[PDB]
RNA sequence: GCGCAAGACGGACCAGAGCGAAAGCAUUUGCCAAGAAUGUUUUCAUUAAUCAAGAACGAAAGUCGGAGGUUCGAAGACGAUCAGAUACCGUCGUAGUUCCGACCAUAAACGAUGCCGACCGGCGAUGCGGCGGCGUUAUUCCCAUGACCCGCCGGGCAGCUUCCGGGAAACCAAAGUCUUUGGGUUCCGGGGGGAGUAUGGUUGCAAAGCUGAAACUUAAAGGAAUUUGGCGAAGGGCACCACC
RNA sequence: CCCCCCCUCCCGGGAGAGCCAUAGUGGUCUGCGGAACCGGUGAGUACACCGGAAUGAUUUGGGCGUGCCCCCGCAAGACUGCUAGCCGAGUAGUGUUGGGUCGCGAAAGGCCUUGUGGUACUGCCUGAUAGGGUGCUUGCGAGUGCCCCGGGAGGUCUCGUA
């Protein structure tokens, strides 16, 4: 059965990105889902994505710019430290002027980046560039 | 198509796909009220009836079980509610 | 095509089209075809949206119109139905035609006599005319179709629905096609039409050309 | 899909979005209540309840009418049967498969379809004895089969 | 006198049909089996040999059929394909000769 | 040609059709039991997916006990073929073939492709259930009923096509979404022989099933496709160094 | 006499359940007002009565399916089955798919203006001028031909013959 929505939710994306489509579905819906794609929308990757509310389980729609070139996600739930995450970057990402890696700290869902000027580091999400 | 737009289509879009499907859940069945024609009191019942129902004060049968809707007793009158 | 107030459709244009036939389809449905498809009647035939043919016909023209040199479009004919129109839309606008045998070292093979590369190439049908499109599709070509309900649409930059196969149908659009591009070149004034004569494109079969010879001197 | 089927399967209820009491329905809690206290007297499982309701009175879901579920309504008066109506009906099912297989002795998929059973049987009992609904004691045999019927 | 009356019959396929398969459930078959035993055993039992005969040089029985049957699904060919005798009364001479005059 | 008697099997109807977990399943009728899919504004509410231990079922052939064994037919018997056949061929022919029990658990038991779940294109068909809509058929008017036709929905065997994409290519709408490498999970293999061999354990009355080596040799053994071969392969044309 | 016949062409008289229509002709739909709102009474469908309430006194016909259904009067329109003058009459008889308002269906007898213009044909056959079976043809495929009675003329219709 279904026990990882991101991951299905990165794929459908991911694919629906590679052939071309401007408008995805997505049918789950979680917290991590949506700070994800407001992460997704601060670093400007994708556009103006809705979202559907129900008293069931929502769905989301996302607008796309075509700014993306993959988009995976870590299984299963790894752990990483603040010496640890430039030998994710360095065998992970295709360059360091471009690619991010989005990862769960304490103050919440994160990227690298500000998380090194921030001086700390948990589990990682996944990844995309 | 490319810049399919899934936001708000024609209400036939809906309609032809699987109430699943659709964007906004909603079932297609309804509830629905009927009477005998030699008779006052009047009942509802729903469009798939699944059990033989009969009218109240047990004069003439009302509904069949089918496997979709219900059929009901020929020369009877009815008008879908809605709210 | 649609913003302006003059380019919408005129009163005898719509005449012209009920009479030819160019609006009954053929019996199957293709997926690129249904934005153009409003309502399927009776019979097994779809019907296309003339307002969108007079709009994607205004579009076409337009995109002819738009190069400098009259010289450098490109008209393709396939099949006997459609040979006198293409000719003497070339003789009146500019074009060059290639009717029948499209040989296919053309655009690529540039050693032949028969080379010659143009901007924008307008073809009669894709199902019925494909080769143009898989040498169009190697060089920096793009292609112009009257493409009808059944036909498949691939390597179309501007697709025509169409009812291409009456003769009168192609015919007539032709002429409707080459009124619009000398019209929005600046030789026809658009306050004046020039519509003499729309049997100028018309095809007949080979009874009816015995027939005529013997009904006139 | 299923857990015992080869195929999967598409086919159930599904509740509309509007959350809200029918306004061309004049139906009050305590006249409903009653009548689910006489339809469960008279003898009937929850799930033919719900039926009988939306069936014959018209209402749309017992939910959207009180703030609480069938079951819950019959163990507030206490009329709930000791044992869930799923589990007696499986119970019951895999009685009549083994007294079918009694007397019909070379049924090969009849045998199948009784270990079939047996195993639903085992997993609802592990489920239901892992939620605190009955003793840890109580366990299903052939011999229970005159027991709990 | 002891028969044994076969039957056969074939659907009919309709001049507007488009699908050349043109099957039949189980149950469809079932219900024009009884239908048939019922109508072929209702002609016989009530008559003698004579008359059921006489009922039998044209296609008495078979226009029955495809009276009663079409309601279910057309079918157009039935013929009674065999009639097997098991058992005779005892012999005598007055049947024999009063089914020749 | 007419009767009697025994055993076996259910053709044509039978299809790139159905059902079942697979091995498999076709005379009608009567009884019992189970189940996929469809529909649902019914109920419990996380009961979920895959699985070492362990368990059920399992074509034919094989062994132990029976009534009864038509036809076919291992081993065998007798003749022709053949330089030589104890082979192909013909006639007999035991055990077997069918039923009731008692067993081993082996096939190219192969779709030579694990299960679940999400996604990415189209076309026209068939099977089930439901649904909407012209017009015909069950004494001529209505209703739903069976059938005919036009569209829609879900699951399954699918067919055609596709520079989506993949692959060494055959080919695949999955064998795809993979160096731009991470959805969950069980079994399983590292050049080829030795060898599924010997020993040991295991089950079995019985054949064998499961588990499963070592020494030594070897630089190839293998998979896809191309170019004229070469065919007691098929289909055309020619020659008196071929024929009439 | 080419004939017992029979067939074809030309010309008339009779039934029909085709179209535009006439006399008796039955229903559906298209708009307007029930002075205006809130409940109780009695087993019956759209009924009667009251109690609230607006100007001491006077009032609105109802239904429970909250929005269209009955009972009225007005305005005329689109469609509709049978009969051949009407009652008899949709009447015996007539049907298996199942009922319904249920198809087809004469009469006997009686009573009154005393009973329709234009317009095609008709292979037996079960159910019509319809549906559903199904021919003859130059041997092969096809354009024409094929109801009852009467009069004249003729006696080998055609397109190519695997």
Known sequence: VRMNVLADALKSINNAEKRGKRQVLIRPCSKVIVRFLTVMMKHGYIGEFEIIDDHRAGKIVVNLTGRLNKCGVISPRFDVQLKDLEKWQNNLLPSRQFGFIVLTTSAGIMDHEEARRKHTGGKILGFFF | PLAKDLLHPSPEEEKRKHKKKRLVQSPNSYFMDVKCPGCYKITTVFSHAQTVVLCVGCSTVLCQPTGGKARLTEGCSFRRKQH | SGALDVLQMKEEDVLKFLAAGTHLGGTNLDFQMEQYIYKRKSDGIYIINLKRTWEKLLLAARAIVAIENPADVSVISSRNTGQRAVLKFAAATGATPIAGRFTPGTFTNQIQTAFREPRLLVVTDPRADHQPLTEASYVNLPTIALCNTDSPLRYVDIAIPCNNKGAHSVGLMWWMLAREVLRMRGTISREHPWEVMPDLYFYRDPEEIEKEEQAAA | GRMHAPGKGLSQSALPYRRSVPTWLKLTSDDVKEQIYKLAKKGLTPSQIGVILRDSHGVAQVRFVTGNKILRILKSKGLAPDLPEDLYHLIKKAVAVRKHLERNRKDKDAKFRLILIESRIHRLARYYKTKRVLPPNWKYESSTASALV | ?101
């Open chain 5, 1 to 101: 006198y002891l028969l044994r009356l076969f039957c056969v019959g074939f659907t009919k396929k309709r001049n507007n049909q488009i699908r050349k398969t043109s099957y039949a459930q189980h149950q469809q078959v079932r219900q024009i089996r009884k239908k048939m035993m019922e109508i072929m055993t209702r002609e016989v039992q009530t008559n003698d040999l004579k008359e059921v005969v006489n009922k039998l040089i044209p296609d008495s029985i078979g226009k029955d059929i495809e009276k009663a049957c079409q309601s279910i699904y057309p079918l157009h060919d039935v013929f009674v394909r065999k009639v097997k005798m098991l058992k005779k009364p005892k012999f005598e001479l007055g049947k024999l000769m009063e089914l020749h005059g």
